[PDB]
Curated annotation (Swiss-Prot), chains A, B:
GO BP field: retinoic acid metabolic process; retinol metabolic process
Coiled coil residues, start to end: none
Assembly information from the UniProt record: Dimer of identical or non-identical chains of two types (E and S) coded by 2 separate genes at different loci.
Residues the record lists as binding NAD(+): 48, 199-204, 223, 228, 292-294, 319, 369
Family named by the database record: Belongs to the zinc-containing alcohol dehydrogenase family. Class-I subfamily.
Matching Gene3D superfamilies: Medium-chain alcohol dehydrogenases, catalytic domain (3.90.180.10), NAD(P)-binding Rossmann-like Domain (3.40.50.720)
SUPFAM superfamilies for this protein: GroES-like (SSF50129), NAD(P)-binding Rossmann-fold domains (SSF51735)
Protein name per the record: Alcohol dehydrogenase E chain
Assigned keywords, A-Z: Acetylation, Cytoplasm, Metal-binding, NAD, Oxidoreductase, Zinc
First-listed, main subcellular location of the protein, grouped into a coarse class: cytoplasm
Cofactor(s) this protein cannot do without: Zn(2+)
């Protein structure tokens, strides 16, 4: 009955930086050609969504944020072939168009159709599907999951198993896949190796899971919030360190602990200083450091390139380096087969209408992932 | 016989920064246990030796520099097993102790016994074998090849083919192996790829050689000195560009030429700016950039980590990533089997006594490699 019609629904609109979300009525246009309209079921609160609020991440406002989610297709536009009404789906904040030089490359994932590098806050066609108070509202990363209904381009959605528990698998849309992939695919963590993980939130925990799955012998968690250590150990950390406890810089501490530097390090926070610290702590001749955290907009880091000349490898990735549309359904299948766990990441559950409380929990340090249910 | 005796011989002593080498008599002590005294036959002038003169590289002075060379063993200390008097050898500025965690690592080559990171300018035992005018003179990288005789630790010397032409294979001691290995081993250049090489001196030409040997389809040379272009093309560059010819930054030019970024880039100059430019010009999702050049002491670069977050890989290496004592004899064997050419690197051959004139040729832009013959 709603196919081809505008849907009025509730969404969490961010009108201004540094302000609460406003849960209010929006109008969601029907899908155009090669677009998919989704009834949201669950969405996680990721720190990158908070970055939009804080201005760490710059994207056009006003906006409907949210990028870690799962739902059910309500309708499809003309020409859509990869999903149908009633399918369970995960929106893909990194698209997979399948046609660009990155999508065709054996390793790359950062499809050239992404709306991350130079955000416009639109659909692929440069327009918006959202109206609120009579005003157009921007999209976020082509996903905009903080709404009872969203519209996404086909290249930004993956069909997943029909029996999937959406209130769990939404985490495959960002935090789990990013961390796990960053360890297994990007870093290529080896059996017997020593890893250091900076930041023990949902993504860092997922990095630890990946390092443990890859066979690391030592996984050293690093966080300034010691309350994060117990869960990090539960998912595989062998030791945890708080930089605030030490007189020496933590790169020196980690070098000492690893008898000359770690094999793999990960920055999973979003600070320039910890990006350089994490590079430094990996072994100077053969270490690898991966940047996962999102730094503040337009700010440069300073480093000595001798850190690299000796032999270190430095890299970053979006979404764990995973080709999104290929990988998401496989990860859901593997979850269903108990190949990895998601429950350790979920510390709180709230209805969507309590989104602001969910952000308060993240900001206070108390939560890992809060899952919002529509 | 000279064995067991102090040798008085000619060497090029650097008494202070930014002055000519002084060609004069030095005393060379006999080798102690696990040391090798070598009669030099040929040594190349590498830009890294000029960095000692210019203060770009800090190492204790006064010093006998030189690190790219070949000669013949005059005598061995107690306990030496890997070379014998009369053997042709190449000194190894990056040692291979075989025992440290780096030597045991499948990939690493920057042996922990090196004298690069924190130079002492001595033998492994913390003493010097050189005196001049009654004063102790420092070693350089455990090699000190700007002397008719030097003494090196066993871990810093490789035996090579007895039939080798030492006036050519001395380049395997630094410039050829560095560039070639940086392409083939460190970057792992792939067949059909597009490469950009910043700096078309001896090392950059060797990077071209390696990119061509790895099957690159396009190899774009970049230099401010257009006189370098003809030789770059002879050894495999498909195109050359001079940044001075353009009104836009060269990373933009290279991104446009490569239809969105190169597969592999190499910084083979030693400037902070060109290191960031080289990284930027590689494709944002899957590009790899390798730092080869040596930058000025204690200077940090500035860069936006979004260049890495999108998926680039940034790395550096010493000596092409090659395990030195394993690799050098194999490279010489490969040269003797006509697997690569060295002649294109050699533009001048001078007696040792003309060392200063050789450095002047380098500084004026007129030479690639000058080989000094003893
Ligand atoms: N690359 C990607 O695709 C991608 C995907 C998802 C998240 N992100 C980013 O990854 C980062 C982590 O996200 P998250 O796990 O949801 O965030 P989070 O739950 O806020 O976790 C960050 C952790 O860092 C800790 N921390 C803060 N400062 C320091 C410090 N100075 N030293 C050590 N620990 C510190 C903090 O206590 C917290 O536990 C954020 O910057 C995200 O924006 C990137
Ligand atoms: N990593 C290693 O193990 C290693 C080994 C050997 C050499 N090096 C370094 O590698 C670098 C090159 O050595 P080399 O080939 O003997 O030196 P070289 O022969 O002086 O060549 C350098 C080239 O860079 C060119 N150049 C200078 N400025 C620019 C610019 N702004 N943009 C483009 N081109 C420019 C210059 O014209 C010259 O052709 C030096 O910094 C060495 O110290 C490192
Ligand atoms: O959490 C994933 C995520 C990122 F990794 C970004 F780089 C980004 F800009 C963003 F908006 C985002 F949501
Ligand atoms: O040319 C090789 C070379 C280097 F790569 C250095 F990093 C260095 F410090 C040095 F002295 C040197 F000779
Ligand atoms: Zn694509
Ligand atoms: Zn996220
Ligand atoms: Zn070693
Ligand atoms: Zn050199």
């Amino acid at each position: 009955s709603t196919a081809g019609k505008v849907i009025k629904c509730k969404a969490a609109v961010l009108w201004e930086e540094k302000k609460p979300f406003s849960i209010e009525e929006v109008e969601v246009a029907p899908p155009k050609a090669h677009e998919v309209r989704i009834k949201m079921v669950a969405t996680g609160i990721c720190r990158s969504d908070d970055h939009v609020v804080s201005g760490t991440l710059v994207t056009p406002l006003p906006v409907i944020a949210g990028h870690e989610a799962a739902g059910i297709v309500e309708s499809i536009g003309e020409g859509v072939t990869t999903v149908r009404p009633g399918d369970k789906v995960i929106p893909l904040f990194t698209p997979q168009c399948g046609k660009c030089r990155v999508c065709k490359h054996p390793e790359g994932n950062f499809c050239l159709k992404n709306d991350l590098s130079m955000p416009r806050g639109t659909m692929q066609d440069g327009t918006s599907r959202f109206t609120c108070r009579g005003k157009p509202i921007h999209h976020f990363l082509g996903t905009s999951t903080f709404s009872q209904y969203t519209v996404v381009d086909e290249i930004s959605v993956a069909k997943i198993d029909a029996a999937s528990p959406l209130e769990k698998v939404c985490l495959i849309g960002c935090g789990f896949s990013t961390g796990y992939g960053s360890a297994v695919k990007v870093a290529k963590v080896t059996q017997g190796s020593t890893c250091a993980v900076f930041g023990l939130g949902g993504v860092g925990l997922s990095v630890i899971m990946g390092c443990k799955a890859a066979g690391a012998a030592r996984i050293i968690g690093v966080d300034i919030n010691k309350d994060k250590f117990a869960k990090a150990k539960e998912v595989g950390a062998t030791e945890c360190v708080n930089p605030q406890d030490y007189k020496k810089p933590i790169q020196e501490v980690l070098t000492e602990m690893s008898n000359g530097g770690v094999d793999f390090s990960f920055e999973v926070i979003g600070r320039l200083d910890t990006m350089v610290t994490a590079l430094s702590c990996c072994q100077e001749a053969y270490g690898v450091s991966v940047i996962v955290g999102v730094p503040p907009d337009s700010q440069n880091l300073s480093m000595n390139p001798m850190l690299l000349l000796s032999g270190r490898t430095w890299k970053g990735a979006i979404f764990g380096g995973l080709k999104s549309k290929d990988s998401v359904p496989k990860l859901v299948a593997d979850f269903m087969a108990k190949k990895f766990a998601l429950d350790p990441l979920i510390t709180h559950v709230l209805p969507f209408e309590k989104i602001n409380e969910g952000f308060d929990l993240l900001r206070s340090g108390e939560s890992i992932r809060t899952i919002l249910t529509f």
